[PDB]
Amino acid sequence: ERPTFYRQELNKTIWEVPERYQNLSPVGGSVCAAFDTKTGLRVAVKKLSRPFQSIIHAKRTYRELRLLKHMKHENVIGLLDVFTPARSLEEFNDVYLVTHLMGADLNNKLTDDHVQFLIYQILRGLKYIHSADIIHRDLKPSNLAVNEDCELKILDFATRWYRAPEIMLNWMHYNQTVDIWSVGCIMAELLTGRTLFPGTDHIDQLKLILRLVGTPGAELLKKISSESARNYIQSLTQMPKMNFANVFIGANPLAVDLLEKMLVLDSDKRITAAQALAHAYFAQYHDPDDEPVADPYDQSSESRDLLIDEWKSLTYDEVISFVPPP
Numbered sequence: 001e002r003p004t005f006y007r008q009e010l011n012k013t014i015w016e017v018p019e020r021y022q023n024l025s026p027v028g029g030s031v032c033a034a035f036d037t038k039t040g041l042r043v044a045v046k047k048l049s050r051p052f053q054s055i056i057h058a059k060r061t062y063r064e065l066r067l068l069k070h071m072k073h074e075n076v077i078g079l080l081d082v083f084t085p086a087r088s089l090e091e092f093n094d095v096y097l098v099t100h101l102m103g104a105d106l107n108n109k110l111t112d113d114h115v116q117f118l119i120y121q122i123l124r125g126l127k128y129i130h131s132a133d134i135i136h137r138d139l140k141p142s143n144l145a146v147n148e149d150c151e152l153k154i155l156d157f158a159t160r161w162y163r164a165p166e167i168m169l170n171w172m173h174y175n176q177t178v179d180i181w182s183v184g185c186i187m188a189e190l191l192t193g194r195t196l197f198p199g200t201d202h203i204d205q206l207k208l209i210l211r212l213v214g215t216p217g218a219e220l221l222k223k224i225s226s227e228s229a230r231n232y233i234q235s236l237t238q239m240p241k242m243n244f245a246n247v248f249i250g251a252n253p254l255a256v257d258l259l260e261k262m263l264v265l266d267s268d269k270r271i272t273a274a275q276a277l278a279h280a281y282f283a284q285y286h287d288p289d290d291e292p293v294a295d296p297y298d299q300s301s302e303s304r305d306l307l308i309d310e311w312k313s314l315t316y317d318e319v320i321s322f323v324p325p326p
């Protein structure tokens with residue numbers, strides 16, 4: 001056991017990886033494309049930079065590695081391998097992560113069947129992520145990778161065009177439907193070929209949002225504990241909710257309807273990922289017996305305040321116990 005490792009120097013640093021990984025080419029922690037000779041796959045190898053430099057780096061390293069090991073779903077980035085050239089904990093300084101080399105992202109105008117398929121897969125991945133009690137919080141085209149056949153994976157990996165309004169108001173307390181807002185913005189752009197809310201700053205962005213969805217109703221105003229937020233919102237010229245048919249001219253009426261259900265100011269009234277999958281817009285793709293869920297991901301490992309060496313040992317344990325996908 002223990003692969004044989006070989007050394008080389010790429011993009012201003014050294015890389016010790018198993019022989020199975022060949023033809024490393026920087027596309028960049030730093031990243032190289034590689035060919036995995038065992039599986040016949042092209043892969044992304046990430047060498048973490050400075051993984052244990054401080055308590056906070058070490059804790060982040062542990063958290064990222066645990067999260068990637070927990071994610072086991074077709075529409076979510078997964079961990080193909082993790083390794084270290086270290087033979088023991090005492091030698092343990094470097095961590096390398098291996099994932100599917102994804103060809104493109106959604107930043108790289110579509111037919112309706114195609115828009116349907118991409119948003120379907122986003123929602124299928126998001127159902128899974130949300131079922132693990134994880135909120136992504138930064139869904140945007142650059143965090144959505146696609147291959148040849150339009151098969152999509154949500155990436156972990158700034159523009160604020162996809163951000164839910166509550167995040168820009170620094171609400172804290174976020175519901176998982178922050179991500180549904182993002183999906184609505186992404187879907188809108190796939191339909192029209194333009195950014196739905198291209199604000200030049202946070203305030204401009206919120207003016208664009210209000211113009212579409214209209215100013216908060218009394219029902220939402222009842223849920224705002226911030227006195228100054230309330231005072232400001234009341235001072236606004238009441239604007240009505242635009243009719244979405246007139247913004248998304250010619251779009252599939254079912255798409256427009258789903259957009260109306262995602263792009264709601266009140267996060268409590270947004271459709272969930274699981275609900276959205278059953279929307280008639282996705283009739284050709286939806287299968288309730290093939291939209292799997294995750295076990296709850298334990299994030300407590302995260303309110304803890306430990307020593308560097310403790311985070312490092314906990315990370316080492318996670319490297320050693322890794323089992324590659326069968």
Ligand SMILES: CCCCCCCCO[C@@H]1O[C@H](CO)[C@@H](O)[C@H](O)[C@H]1O
Pocket residue numbers: 165166169171172173174175206216220223233265266267268
């Ligand atoms: C001027 C623009 C106002 C933005 C209004 C955002 C309302 C967001 O929705 C809210 O978000 C919270 C966090 O999940 C919840 O606690 C609330 O129940 C909900 O109303």
